[PDB]
Amino acid sequence: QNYSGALETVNQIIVNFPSFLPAFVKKMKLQLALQDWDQTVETAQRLLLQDSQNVEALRMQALYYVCREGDIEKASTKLENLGNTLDAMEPQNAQLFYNITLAFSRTCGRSQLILQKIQTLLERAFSLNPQQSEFATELGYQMILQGRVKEALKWYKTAMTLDETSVSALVGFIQCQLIEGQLQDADQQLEFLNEIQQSIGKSAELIYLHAVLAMKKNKRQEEVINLLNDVLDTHFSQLEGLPLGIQYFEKLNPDFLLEIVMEYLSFCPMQPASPGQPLCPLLRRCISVLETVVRTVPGLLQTVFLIAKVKYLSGDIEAAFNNLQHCLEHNPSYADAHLLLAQVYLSQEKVKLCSQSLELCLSYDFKVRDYPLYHLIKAQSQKKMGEIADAIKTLHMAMSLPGMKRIGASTKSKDRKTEVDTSHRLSIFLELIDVHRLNGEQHEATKVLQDAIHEFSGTSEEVRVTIANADLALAQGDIERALSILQNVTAEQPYFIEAREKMADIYLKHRKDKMLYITCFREIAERMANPRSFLLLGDAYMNILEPEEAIVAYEQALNQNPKDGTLASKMGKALIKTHNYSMAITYYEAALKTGQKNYLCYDLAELLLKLKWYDKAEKVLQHALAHEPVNELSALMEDGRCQVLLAKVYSKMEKLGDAITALQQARELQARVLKRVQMEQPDAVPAQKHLAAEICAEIAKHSVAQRDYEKAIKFYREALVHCETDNKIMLELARLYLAQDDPDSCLRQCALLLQSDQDNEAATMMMADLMFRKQDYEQAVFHLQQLLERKPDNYMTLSRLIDLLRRCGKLEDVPRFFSMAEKRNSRAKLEPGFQYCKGLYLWYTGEPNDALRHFNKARKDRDWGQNALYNMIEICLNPDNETVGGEVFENLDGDLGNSTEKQESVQLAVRTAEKLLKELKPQTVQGHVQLRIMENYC
Amino acid sequence: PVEIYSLLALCACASRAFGTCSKAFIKLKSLETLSSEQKQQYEDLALEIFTKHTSKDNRKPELDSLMEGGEGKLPTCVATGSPITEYQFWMCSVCKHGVLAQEISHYSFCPLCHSPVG
Fold first, then answer.
1. Distance between CA atoms of A484 and A469, rounded to whole angstroms?
2. Is B72 on the interface with A (CB under 8 A)?
3. Option in A512, A518, A579 nearest B50 (CB)
4. HSE-up of A453 (CA within 13 Å, CB side)?
5. A151 touches A143 (CB < 8 A)
6. Mind telling me which residue stretches traverse the membrane in this protein (chain A)?
7. CA-to-CA separations, A670 to A222, A336, A693, A718, B9, in angstroms, rounded
């Protein structure tokens, strides 16, 4: 295992002997065993550049496009070139064509254009040997994969007449019979093969066709699951000790394993819930199965689409999205990746992006119309958009497909057939009932519900049909029909949790009874104690405003599934709402010590920050960054956000240089994120560019605090080079173009910001100040007047306009804008910003007492009161607004100025302006300096 | 709900019922009509109260013993806004609400409907 020393000695071989092919073929086969498809491609290509007829390197390039890239065009063209080398080298070797066709068919992922090329290679083998049953069996198999079950039947029947002993042909014929619903023939022929099996040894295929027959006969799910467990555990027993050679792909049979996974997924959940639910061991088996197919042939992209789907169904939507992005960068035209991406966006309520990914899925493959799950997801998207009538059409298009109903001979459905998942079949019925219900077609909803009761009878999913009858009963106002159905679900039945939640919800909605709600929820806790039911019980108690029992529920969950960060965060929230901060802190520390998800650093930091323990947050985030930085794309972005967050904390620590170093370390990590995201996750590019913009904006802010306004312009220009149209970045570079005396570039950023959003008040006021500096006072006024005619209640724009009108000498224009605020908002007179704007006006008209009265009504407000206080201090220092110590007038007024009455009342106003200054709490060093100056003016 | 849970949070805070105040703040932040800004402002005030005192009741109201509804409800007196614990008591011939037999003596007209007392 000294791969670095081996690579050095191999480079010495290739330096001494550049032409020596055997080294490269060994290096290529070793690199496939090392899962290194990149260097396996380099060695295959470097070998093909020296031996263009090399069948193994051509086979390895055709396998690369089938087994990492999923690229149908590159796979079909490398299969064409491989076939043309067979025409060049032993064209009569029908066995070599057959061997090639087995490898490529068992790995194809049901691609029609790959299967057409494979079929022509196998048809050439069959024209060379028409007597060969097995060539006809694999034509039978390739016709199942193309959906051509009529041609599959002919190719298996001809394989049987070519060899009556070809059990391979009979297994394939039984698979066609089961797809056709010819169950009685499949049953008898499987019993016949189960007697013959002792002469063959146990085959996972025969157990699988028993599991499929048992599923079609509606046998108990634990029996079908136990048969599939025996299919997997017998199948893997064949593969023991084998090297990762091309023969492993034929023996592993990826195609067969993905069907098995899809019917484990018929028994799995249909929702992206977090771990800790009694179904989850079925998803755990699915992960293990798909991980063997990812060890070997992940470019059968249906594998990594199914890992993304299993990740989604276990609540890891970020891992699902990353695996889908990865699939779409192996092949952008891969329709199933867009189909699950629609389910990702649907779960996020991103209904527009769900519709766009459905339209992309269809644009790349019109044969997506042949799958009921497509029509279900488009109906879900249409229903959420309110396109109810078109959701009726797509659910009827779903029901038109074969296998969506129990049907005999002379079928109305005549398209290519598929093995419909019972949970999809259920969902398409249940959502047609809901879409008719939403359309007011209560009779059609009830008719299709009776059809669903008939369709799913005797299954565990029949209880979901009874809960759907209770849902339709609630829409019909039959609340007691709903309750009696739900009450008829008891401790020994599946779906009792949802039944008792619905009973609880009904009693809280209709009977207004929290105790019937709580007793239904305590029945969930008593009968069906598990981490998800205890999490849901917690959330129920939070809706009931009883967080202590919610915390008991979150404890009853979290002591059973300590891996769930979502539960640990919900636990944290309830503990914060109940002053249990040490438990929240220590649960977040345990989740971070067990390596859980990105946001847990933010949960713990923002908690400690809101508790004012900024130093504890600093040390926590430093400890969360004490590892050697992990090179995974997730971990790079996580550490980048941890560094950004540590810089946000360092801001409150006054550690602004460390904040810059942490932000530059985040910029370094974020560059490594972008240079992979552009190649494997391109849909994340705007968000990751925006995070790079925000990093550069914070570097610029810290450089402003360091008085390096040139670095501030530089790093806000970098923030624009990342994101040219972020409102805060535009406004902040406008502020710096202003602060460094470029009013023209400031006006460019104002004009662009106003073009991007006309209602941006700061851009209008900054532009009006620049018009005022350019002596375009009429424009400065008119743009603030337009902004007040859009937003009459706007004390910033009003107080800016008042000072413009003071500096112009046009105070008479102001009362209009007070009246506009009063007309919009009769309470505007009560607001500290109105009281501040009014206090300013009276100081300019000449009424210092009325100015003081209106400033006083504002004076405690955090903006308007702070600014009012400074103007109260101006009046209390100097109520006559004189030159203090001016000899032209302080030698006059003596008939009042020599009196104790004027002296003592003025000096009381001075000595109490110090108390107004004690009410001016500063928040900056400039605030402390201006405060100290005005205390010294007193 | 904004007016209700604001006034309840205020009276609960002034009462030092900071857990009942926490109930009212959770109810406020849940409201889908609020902006993230308003949700944060209510959270800032809740956390200010919680850090300066606690997020739990230092003194406890007990009226939730009726408001869970399972045991039923005593009639709330229109003179006082508290449940009537009397076995039999005055009721308004117009609106048919109850009043405590001591508290009704304070009035000429029904506190709810302003009809003359009888």
1. 11
2. no
3. A579
4. 11
5. yes
6. none
7. 48, 30, 10, 14, 44
- Measuring CA to CA, how many Å separate A574 from each of A124, A548, B4, B23, B60? 69, 8, 22, 11, 19
Structural tokens at position A229:
């467990």
Give percent helix, percent strand, percent coil of chain B, each to the nearest 5.
Answer: 40, 10, 50
> CB contact, 8 Å: B88 with chain A?
no
Give resolution, Å, one decimal.
3.5
Q: B117 vs chain A: nearest CA distance in angstroms?
A: 32
Taking CA atoms, A67 is separated from A96, A299, A304, in Å, by: 20, 4, 11
Q: Does B68 touch chain A (CB under 8 A)?
A: yes
| C-alpha dist (Å) from residue A497 to A182, A463, A526 | 38, 11, 11
CB pairs under 8 A between A and B: 39
Residue whose C-alpha is closest to residue A731's, from A711, A744, A747: A747
Alpha-carbon torsion angle A585, A589, A590, A593, nearest 10 = 180
Q: Containing H/E element for B91?
A: strand B90-91
What was the experiment behind these coordinates? cryo-EM
B32 has a chain A CB within 8 A of its CB:
no
Dist CA A528 CA A539 (whole Å): 16
Write the DSSP symbol of residue B75: P
Whether A269 and A277 have beta carbons less than 8 Å apart is answered as: yes
Residue A902's identity, in one-letter code, is: K
Cβ within 8 Å of residue B33, ≥6 positions away: B2
Give me the amino acid identity at A588: Y
Residues of A in contact with B71 (CB under 8 A): 515
Question: Residue A253 has which token pair?
Answer: 């049979």
Residue A651: Cβ within 10 Å count: 17
Q: Are A430 and A468 in contact (CB under 8 A)?
A: yes
Distance from C-alpha of A391 to C-alpha of A430, rounded to nearest angstrom: 13
Interface test with B, best of A544, A579, A606 (most B CBs within 10 A): A579
Nearest CB among B22, B51, B55 relative to A611 is that of B51
CB contact B50 to A (< 8 Å):
yes
- Gap from B67 CA to chain A (nearest CA, Å): 8
Helix axes A531-543, A496-509, angle to 10 degrees: 10
Alpha helix ranges (H) inside A809-893: 815-824, 832-845, 848-858, 864-877
Q: State how far residue B56 is from chain A, nearest Cα, in angstroms.
A: 6
Q: What are phi and psi of A510, to 5 degrees?
A: -100, -45
Task: Inform me whether the C-beta atom of residue A516 falls under 8 Å from chain B C-beta atoms.
Answer: yes
User: CA separation (Å) from A505 to A488, A491, A510, A523?
Assistant: 16, 19, 8, 14
How many other CB atoms are found less than 10 A from the CB of residue A747? 18
- Closest in B26, B56, B70 to A579, CB measured: B56
Strand ranges for A428-550 from DSSP E: none
Alpha-carbon gap: B98 to the closest alpha carbon of chain A (Å): 22
Collect all residues of chain A within an 8 Å Cβ-Cβ radius of residue B47.
610
CB crowding A769-780: b at 16 or more within 10 Å, else e: bbbbeeeebeeb
